[PDB]
Design a protein around this ligand. Structure first.
Ligand SMILES: *[C@@H]1O[C@H](CO)[C@@H](O)[C@H](O)[C@H]1NC(C)=O
Ligand SMILES: Nc1ncnc2[nH]cnc12
Length: 245
């Protein structure tokens, strides 16, 4: 399991938590020195438990699929909550079994459905460590509309920060003041699968992407990524989604 406490958190402690979340995910090999997530994990071992504590010390436990860093559901006190989708229904066979009841949220866990339920796109929702405190608070007691926005904050401050060093650094900048995500943050979040695929294909193509990937950089400009010497490959991406998924 991994844990993070908002009480006493600072950029260093968050950075160390994200390093620890990455290290909790299994891999058999690295590609261009980036861990390659596994194609598949059978049964309960597929799920990592992430214990999150708000400023006031109240907690939720979040279930994360270790093959794709996808948040499936969470436990708050005696109630489990799962996204309305088959992978999350499967997870509910393995995690939080001792909850007194299980609620299926009235949306899947993809960005498209969460943004419709929240009534706002990611671009308009401030993120940061205060926002994560608020999100844990919101998720402690059921509210499906408020929960959708809380889950967008939770996903971006945990899973997306694990996937990209840049996004970790953006949340560190927001340790004490929330701010809507940068243009590059949205671009990277949207591109993880594509980048993963191209970096794995590059291993048999002399480091060259078979299909260049368009990103927004840290200055807000559009750039074309063509090969593994790009800083997005050498410094930024931290985990690769296996091409088998
Ligand atoms: C490979 O990527 C590097 C770093 O972004 C870039 O400078 C270079 O132009 C790329 N090479 C080709 C042939 O696209
Ligand atoms: N539920 C989720 N978990 C992790 N990353 C996601 N990206 C969009 N939805 C996600």
């Amino acid at each position: 399991d991994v844990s993070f406490r908002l009480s006493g958190a600072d950029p260093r402690s968050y950075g160390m938590f994200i390093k620890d979340l990455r290290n909790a995910l299994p891999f058999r090999e690295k590609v261009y020195n980036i861990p390659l997530l596994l194609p598949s994990v059978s049964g309960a071992g597929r799920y990592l438990l992430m214990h999150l504590f708000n400023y006031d010390g109240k907690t939720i436990t979040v279930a994360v699929d270790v093959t794709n860093v996808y948040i499936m559901g969470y436990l708050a006190d005696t109630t489990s909550y799962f996204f309305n989708e088959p992978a999350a229904e499967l997870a509910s066979q393995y995690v939080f079994r001792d909850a007194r009841r299980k609620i299926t949220l009235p949306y899947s866990g993809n960005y498209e459905r969460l943004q419709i339920a929240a009534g706002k796109p990611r671009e308009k929702i401030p993120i940061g460590l205060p926002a994560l405190d608020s999100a844990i608070s919101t998720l402690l007691h059921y509210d499906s509309t408020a929960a959708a926005g809380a889950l967008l904050v939770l996903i971006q401050t945990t899973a997306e920060a694990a996937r990209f060093k840049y996004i970790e650094q953006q949340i560190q900048e927001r340790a004490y003041r929330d701010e809507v995500p940068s243009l590059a943050t949205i671009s990277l979040e949207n591109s993880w699968s594509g980048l993963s695929k191209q970096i794995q294909l590059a291993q048999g193509n002399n480091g060259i992407f078979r299909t260049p990937i368009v990103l927004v950089d840290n200055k807000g400009n559009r750039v074309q990524i063509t090969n593994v010497t790009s800083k997005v490959v050498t410094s930024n991406i931290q985990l690769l989604l296996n091409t088998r998924n």
